[PDB]
Structure formats: C-alpha cells, structure tokens
Design a protein around this ligand. Structure first.
Ligand SMILES: [Mg+2]
Ligand SMILES: [Mg+2]
Ligand SMILES: [Mg+2]
Lengths: 249, 255
DNA sequence: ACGAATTCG
DNA sequence: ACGAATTCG
C-alpha cells in the first residue's frame, strides 16, 4: 500500500505574517492529505492552532515551550502506540530527537524527527547529534521500519566526517537518483522570506530510512510550499518535502 | 658588547608593536627602543609598523638599518644592527588573497661569518580568517624550504596561529622547527598575547595565545639557546609598549 | 538561517 | 585583536 508524509520546517520563529503563513501551511497539507507530517520550529500558539485545524491528526510534540518539533499522525490510517524523546545533552538551541512508534500500512514503524543544531559555527555539535540519530535508527527490531525526516542543517562534508550513512541506512533523495527538481530545500534566490540579499542554497531537509530489503520503497519526492501567499511571502523560508513510499509486507 | 666568545651567536627580538594604536604611540615606541638598547639584539623583527614609527626608530634605535615590508598603511620591518650584519638583499613575497595587506618579507644577510635568510610576516588576523591564515603559513613554510641549502633560514613573526590550525596544515615540515618547542615548551614564555596580564586593548575578558612564533630550518647546525619575553613593564602612561609581548631569542650557529 | 561586519563585555 | 551577540548586506 502507498503512504505519504511531509516534513517541513515552518519557521514559527518568524513572527511576521505568521497567522497567514500557518493557514498557508495547512492549505498545503489539505491538498496532499499526508498520512504523517513532521514539523520543525513549531511554537505554542502555532501548536494550539494545529490542534484545532488538524484535529483529524494525533499531534505529538517535542516540547511545550520555546520552539520545537511535532509529528502529526492521520487518525484512521496511523495507530499511535508510544512516543519517545531523546535529549541532545550539549544543544544550545533546545534541540532533541522525537520518535513515535506506530502501525501504518500493516507494518510497525518508528518515525523520527529533529531540528539539528543550526548554522555553520555549530557544525561539531550538529555532527554529534547526527550520530545520536543514526545510533537510534539502529535500535529498532529488524522487522520495524525506521523513517527519520527533519531539518538536519547538514552539509555533505559533515556526513562524510560522520563516517557516511551506515550500510543499512538510506537517504530517500539519493535512493531516487538525486533528482534536481527537489534537491535544494532552503534557497535564498527563490525564497525571499529572510530578506537575505544574496543567493545560497542547501539540502538541509533530509529523509533517512532503515528497512528490511524491499519492504520500504520510495516512489516520489517533491517540494511543497512553493507558492506565495496573499502577503507576498511564502509559508516558510524552507520548502517542505512530500514523499510517497510503498510499504511491502 | 658582543665579544669573541659570542661570535657564534645570533640574538634577535620579534615583536608586534601595535602601531595601529595611535594612543601614546611615541612613548610606547620609546619603550620598545629602551628594550632594544638593553639587549642590543643583532636583528629585530617588527609587525604593525607605520610610517611615523619608522621615524621614532630612526631617532631612538639609530644603530639599526630599517628594511620595511611596505611604504604606507601598516607593515612589517626587519632591523639590522650596523657593524654586525651585512645587508645583501631584500625580497618581498605577496599574499595574493590577503584582505589586510599582509605579505612575507625576507632579508638576506651575512652575520658572524654565515649567510642567513631572515623572514617575517604578520599572518591574517582573527579566528574568522583561519583559512587564509593557513594558506599564508603554507607560503611561508614553502619559502623556508626553497632557500639554498647552505643558507640558514629563520622566520620570526606574528603568526596569529592556534595549535589546531598547524595540525590542519599537517604540522611543521621535517626540517623546520619551532624554537619554543625545541626548548621544551617552557611555561614562562608560552603566551605572547594575554588580555588578563595586558590591558592595552581594554578587552574585559581573559584570553591568551601563542601568536608570536619562531621557525628555523636546520642538522644540528642551528641550536636555540634561550627564549624569553620582553615588554612586560608598564610605561609612564600606565600602558604597555604593545598589546603583545615580544620574544627575545638567542641561537648558536654550529659546525 | 547565508557570510561579513560590527558592537559589547 | 578575545568570543558572544547583534546587525548589515
Ligand atoms: Mg529557521
Ligand atoms: Mg516509481
Ligand atoms: Mg594587532
């Protein structure tokens, strides 16, 4: 059976046009009706909005104050079994690792998200956090399918410094042949929200998975959130990623 | 005076004398020159010299010939004791990507019956410019290796280096030694820039670094004898000659 | 949440 | 000529 999710850093720390941009995020979610949504940079009033607007999803959060991650699980498609939060002891930005154990498509999943330490200056801590994520991905039983989707803030060289992805962990964008149309998820030439008067682009938002051979097969990957809202800005400074996969029992 | 017994020795001071701080500069220059008068080094390597400072050196260090790394702005200089050092030529090597007018100054001399290439630089400043500083260090080390095998090469200057940056470079080449390391990393002269002990910059924090370093290319032919700090006395104005301490080094040239 | 510049302690 | 924090482009 086919499943879909979106992962999206929705820039709740930008207070400008935030109500309109939150409505814009959810209009995108309504269009694609994903089974799972992974969000980063949620803030408390944004979470309160989602609890009403997305009342058809079970909402799991990474914290209750500041800014944090969330995982939304479509009721009637996804059975919620537990949540786990793993700290990043040396974060300076309240980052952590949020996991949920669920049933979806007839199989058990561990679904994970994080907003890894931001900016070039904090590369070393970001690498330590990536190692924590990768270590946690190895802990689930082999019959459980593990998906991480989140804002990694990664540069390719940092993954190399980490040792590269393990032999049994795959990046969905790489798996699909490194398609150019959805490569960059943060692009200051195409996205004006931060008003950065220069052109930089990065593949900060990434999807990793661990599954028994042939039991999880990515089928599509697309950017979402590409349309300006009435205020002339985008829902976020990031594009979202929409991924569909076949879950084979 | 430098008699027969010490004819095998080269002594020198290297010092970033902070000519970019105009406040109290004439008095601070007199403080530097008082140090030069006390130790009478054969050679002085200076960084952050400015044109007015050259005039102060001509007045209060008149026994030294001045070779400069540029004519305007701020620049390095090598001072040669008249009657001891024979000047043979001056070479300047550019750092094409510097944003701070930095370069490599080489002065070829004869002293004590030996040929020397004496080099100084003020490598790119601040943690943010690490990449360019490492590129400049590679230029310096390459030039040290290129000199004729008969010549004795000494670099002394303000490197702005952090230890981790020399490791990123791959370490000093096999025939190039750091004088402080050679002498066993003595604690008394380890830090040459120290905002707890020196308040010239008025930084309200305590940080210390070994920015000022001496490299030499040598087998057993060049033996460091001593390394000591200078410039640790406050002057009449209540400030030091510079935000850096200077380094006083003696080396023996051996058969 | 970019790199470069600047301020503050 | 420090590092952190903030601001500029
Ligand atoms: Mg952000
Ligand atoms: Mg297909
Ligand atoms: Mg200086």
């Amino acid at each position: 059976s086919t499943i879909s999710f979106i992962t999206w850093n929705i820039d709740g720390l930008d207070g400008c046009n935030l109500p309109e941009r939150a409505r814009g995020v959810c209009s995108c979610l309504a269009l694609y009706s994903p089974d799972v949504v992974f969000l980063q940079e949620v803030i408390p009033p944004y979470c309160a909005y989602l609890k009403k607007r997305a009342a058809s999803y079970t909402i799991i959060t990474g914290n209750e104050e500041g800014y944090f991650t969330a995982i939304l699980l479509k009721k009637g498609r996804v059975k919620f079994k537990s949540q786990e939060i793993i700290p990043f002891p040396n974060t300076k930005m309240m980052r952590n690792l949020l996991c949920v154990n669920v049933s979806l498509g007839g199989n058990e999943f561990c679904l994970m998200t994080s907003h890894l330490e931001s900016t070039r200056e904090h590369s070393a801590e970001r690498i330590r956090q990536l190692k924590t994520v990768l270590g946690k991905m190895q802990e689930a039983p082999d019959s459980t399918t593990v998906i991480f989707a989140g804002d990694t803030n990664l540069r390719d060289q940092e993954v190399i410094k980490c040792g590269g992805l393990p032999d049994n962990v795959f990046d969905a964008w790489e798996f699909l042949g490194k398609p150019k149309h959805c490569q960059y998820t943060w692009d200051t030439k195409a996205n004006n929200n931060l008003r950065i008067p220069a052109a930089y682009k990065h593949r900060f938002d990434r999807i990793f998975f661990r599954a028994e051979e042939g039991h999880l097969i990515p089928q599509s990957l697309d950017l979402v959130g590409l349309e300006k809202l009435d205020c002339g800005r985008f829902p976020s400074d990031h594009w979202g990623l929409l991924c569909t996969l076949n879950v084979v029992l």
